[PDB]
Amino acid sequence: KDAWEIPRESLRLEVKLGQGGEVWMGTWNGTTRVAIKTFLQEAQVMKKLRHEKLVQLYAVVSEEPIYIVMEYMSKGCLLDFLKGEMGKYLRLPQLVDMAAQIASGMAYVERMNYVHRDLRAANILVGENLVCKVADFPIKWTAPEAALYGRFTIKSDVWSFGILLTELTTKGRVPYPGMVNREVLDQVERGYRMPCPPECPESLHDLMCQCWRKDPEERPTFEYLQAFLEDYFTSTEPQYQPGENL
């Protein structure tokens, strides 16, 4: 139907990665390794977004079975990355850089006037050299005005980014530990915010709390978050010292 179309025979499905449809690792033509998701709204959104920190759409097959060919991220989702063997070795410099890449991708989304709506570690993908990219275009990750009234905006994504900062600094732990969804909603609406993770510097938790401001228009932009995180160990914590875990 459009210029993202390709012949199905040009794809070779090699390994199954996940289920829900399914996602496969394969080869496009004979030269390019790709991820193949086996619905159109996701592709239509990606067709307009091209950024180094967003999993890139490659091609689409519109005749059933429907395929969505995408960039292959070799290390899986960030959640599983943090929770696996790597987590014990990651320290604050690596986690802040990873968060910086995520904000760079979201800063692009922001400039394009799009909204993600489900930002969290399980929807970031990891590649080689600690490359992180936003993918997959959850009350504990959702801003109150979006969870209660369906007001999803780039500012609800910033709220989500704040929660995702707790995932990074706890290396994959679930937010609001020990609390069920209904208790989080009741407590957050009454003003509760998660405290400073252990070994997390106050300056990073202040950034979290800014993402968690009641008024969505007072939450920082992703442009701001990206610059703050890129500059973090010169402008904000130039005397950082490694701890027991961060």
Ligand SMILES: */C=C/C(=O)Nc1cccc(-c2c(-c3ccc(N4CCN(C)CC4)cc3)[nH]c3ncn(CC)c(=O)c23)c1
């Ligand atoms: C948070 C879990 C998650 O998102 N899993 C997941 C489901 C479906 C597809 C992908 C995926 C992967 C991917 C890469 C590498 C791995 N590994 C399996 C376990 N060994 C130990 C390490 C490597 C699993 C999954 N790569 C992908 N590339 C692109 N996409 C489309 C956006 C993927 O979905 C994807 C992960």
